[PDB]
Amino acid sequence: METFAFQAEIAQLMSLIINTFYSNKEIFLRELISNSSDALDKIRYESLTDPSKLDSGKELHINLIPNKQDRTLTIVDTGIGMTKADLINNLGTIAKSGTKAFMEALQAGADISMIGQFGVGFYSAYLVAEKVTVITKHNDDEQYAWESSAGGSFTVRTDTGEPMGRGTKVILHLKEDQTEYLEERRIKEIVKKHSQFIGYPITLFVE
Numbered sequence: 024m025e026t027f028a029f030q031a032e033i034a035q036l037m038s039l040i041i042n043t044f045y046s047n048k049e050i051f052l053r054e055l056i057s058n059s060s061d062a063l064d065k066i067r068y069e070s071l072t073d074p075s076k077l078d079s080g081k082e083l084h085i086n087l088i089p090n091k092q093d094r095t096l097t098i099v100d101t102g103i104g105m106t107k108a109d110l111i112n113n114l115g116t117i118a119k120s121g122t123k124a125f126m127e128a129l130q131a132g133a134d135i136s137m138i139g140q141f142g143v144g145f146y147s148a149y150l151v152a153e154k155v156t157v158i159t160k161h162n163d164d165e166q167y168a169w170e171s172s173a174g175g176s177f178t179v180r181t182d183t184g185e186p187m188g189r190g191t192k193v194i195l196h197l198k199e200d201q202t203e204y205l206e207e208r209r210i211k212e213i214v215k216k217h218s219q220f221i222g223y224p225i226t227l228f229v230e
């Protein structure tokens with residue numbers, strides 16, 4: 024396992040998300056499903072000129088898996104996936120510049136729900152999760168596990184777990200007061216409200 028320090032700007036973003044009083048936490052799901060949709064578009068685009076890109080899996084979907092016993096909400100997609108370099112470089116984002124633009128917008132009157140307009144929507148996971156684990160597999164690299172409970176650092180390791188073919192799995196270890204996001208009715212409500220125009224099947228698993 025390798026441990027890395029977040030860039031100062033990203034540690035500042037995470038602290039703002041964790042510490043700011045902001046009741047509209049539900050937007051984390053829209054942000055994560057939006058990232059999944061973007062990753063699925065990328066592999067579909069590459070497959071148009073190279074059909075062998077889909078040898079690691081032809082299905083393009085998003086699965087939402089709540090687990091009440093482990094207190095986790097997992098979002099699985101079969102998108103392009105991230106390489107080790109992508110994971111280290113802020114999960115494939117330009118997060119340093121995105122954070123700068125987002126923080127300026129917040130000072131001017133914008134609110135936390137607009138985070139996605141700054142290309143740093145992933146970090147909204149910290150509105151509801153005490154720890155986030157990202158398992159990812161890109162065609163050109165091995166399967167990795169990224170993890171962070173914030174606190175200024177993240178870890179990366181080769182994942183020896185269940186092989187995923189291709190794509191990304193985001194495991195949200197929920198905060199104790201955020202268990203409403205494991206309830207079927209609550210998840211359905213959020214998906215219908217914010218993700219009605221996502222062009223891939225979104226399957227809400229049951230227990």
Ligand SMILES: Cc1onc(-c2ccc(O)cc2O)c1-c1ccccc1
Nearest residue numbers: 055058059061062102104105115191
């Ligand atoms: C590329 C890529 O490959 N997997 C993800 C991914 C990142 C986060 C996530 O929640 C789900 C995902 O599929 C992304 C990605 C990187 C930056 C912006 C949007 C997608």
